[PDB]
Design a protein around this ligand. Structure first.
Ligand SMILES: O=C(O)CC[C@@H]1NC(=O)NC1=O
Ligand SMILES: [Fe+3]
Length: 402
């Protein structure tokens, strides 16, 4: 008893209780009020005519990119070129290069301009099969500019057939105006930005860049405390350049996830395992930054810590708008299997966004966010990159290709 039905689909359920991809024999998938209402093997059936026959095509949950900075203005391309040519970073920086140039360009960009700049980026993720994307602020570094980014994020979720989770990342770096008083900036975030963002219902979570050239463990704790007071979930950019113990702090605050982790240690891994925190791998940033210190994948696996994989789309360290390329890199650079990568962009990605109960698996009762592909096996999703392969892209039970 459901409005729409997809006949003859070969489901890669990605169910948490099923091995590998949770692939099953051909089934019939029916949706009711935006949710998967029923999953019945075809042998138990023998339509109406509005029922769509997929003729055995593979179906999977919609992909999820749980860590992006896709909203931004300006371009760091010229700066990159100069570096490749051999110009010292000091010269580039003294002339205002680096993350600050993105901040100035983004502050200067109007809300309408950021929206128009982000549209084409989100459309590329959409055609790859991404149905839920997380977008962070962090390039505003002022109360008005940080919320401006969050508003653009909400706008994208309303204008396009894709779910958007917003994350306040005001603690991405210390703005120029607070250069000599970092703690003053932290107070602003805690006493003004988080409260204003929460009051407007603009933030689903709060993030922090905890590092030596970022925010200290103490300053990071101040932020999580404020988030806590407004009932906002927390997460953080941890152990990317060094270990300050940030992952353990985040775990103690019930973080949804910790991201990067190149320098994560055993103690931290133990904390993550115990608090059920998701470890988010960002292979693209690792690639582009030409890093050599690999995240402790083997240890994370041994401890059973779920690992999500994300594109980390951002103008500074990962200018690649592709979730699937990230999956390919997680396998090639971090040694993940195609099945770990797939769970990394479904089941585990959902959990990293606090949506473990609603998305990421083809189970009765969960939201109807699924994809019908023209390729034969799910392993191919992490393998062949750059080709449009969607036959059907369903979000909340409704077709979105046309
Ligand atoms: O440089 C940028 O624009 C963002 C870099 C990005 N943010 C962070 O905390 N780590 C990264 O790699
Ligand atoms: Fe990031």
């Amino acid at each position: 008893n459901c409005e729409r039905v997809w006949l003859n689909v070969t489901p890669a359920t990605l169910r948490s209780d099923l091995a590998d991809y949770g692939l099953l024999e051909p089934h019939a998938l029916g949706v009711h009020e935006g949710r998967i209402h029923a999953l019945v093997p075809m042998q138990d059936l023998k339509y109406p005519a509005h029922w769509q026959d997929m003729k055995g095509k593979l179906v999977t949950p919609g992909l999820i990119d749980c860590h992006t900075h896709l909203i931004f203005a300006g371009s760091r391309a010229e700066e990159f070129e100069l570096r490749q040519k051999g110009v010292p970073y000091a010269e580039i920086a003294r002339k205002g290069g680096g993350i600050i140039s993105t901040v100035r360009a983004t502050r200067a960009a109007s809300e309408d301009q950021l929206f128009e700049l982000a549209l084409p980026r989100v459309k590329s993720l959409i055609r790859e099969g991404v149905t839920t994307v997380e977008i962070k602020s962090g390039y505003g570094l002022t109360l008005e500019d940080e919320l401006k980014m969050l508003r653009v994020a909400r706008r994208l979720g309303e204008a396009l057939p894709i779910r958007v989770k917003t994350t306040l990342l005001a603690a991405h770096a210390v703005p120029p105006e607070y250069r000599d008083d970092p703690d003053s900036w932290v107070e602003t975030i805690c006493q003004e930005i988080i409260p204003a963002a929460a009051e407007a219902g603009l933030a689903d979570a709060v993030d922090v860049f905890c590092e030596h050239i970022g925010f200290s463990l103490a300053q990071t704790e101040q932020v999580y405390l404020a988030a806590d007071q407004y009932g906002l979930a927390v997460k953080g950019h941890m152990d990317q350049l060094s270990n300050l113990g940030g992952s353990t702090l985040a775990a103690n605050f019930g973080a949804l996830s910790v991201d990067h982790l190149e320098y994560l240690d055993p103690e931290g891994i133990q904390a993550l395992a115990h608090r059920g925190v998701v470890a988010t791998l960002l292979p693209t940033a690792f690639y582009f930054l030409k890093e050599t210190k690999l995240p402790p994948v083997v240890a994370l696996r041994k401890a059973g810590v779920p690992m999500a994989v994300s594109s980390d789309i951002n103008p500074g360290t990962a200018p690649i708008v592709s979730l699937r390329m990230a999956m390919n890199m997680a396998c090639t650079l971090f040694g993940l299997t195609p099945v770990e990568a797939m769970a990394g962009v479904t089941r585990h990605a959902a959990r990293a966004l606090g949506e473990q109960e609603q998305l990421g698996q083809l189970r009765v009762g969960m939201l109807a966010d699924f994809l019908v592909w023209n390729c034969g096996h799910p392993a191919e999703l992490s393998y062949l990159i750059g080709v449009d392969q969607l036959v059907s892209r369903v979000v909340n039970g409704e077709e979105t290709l046309h």
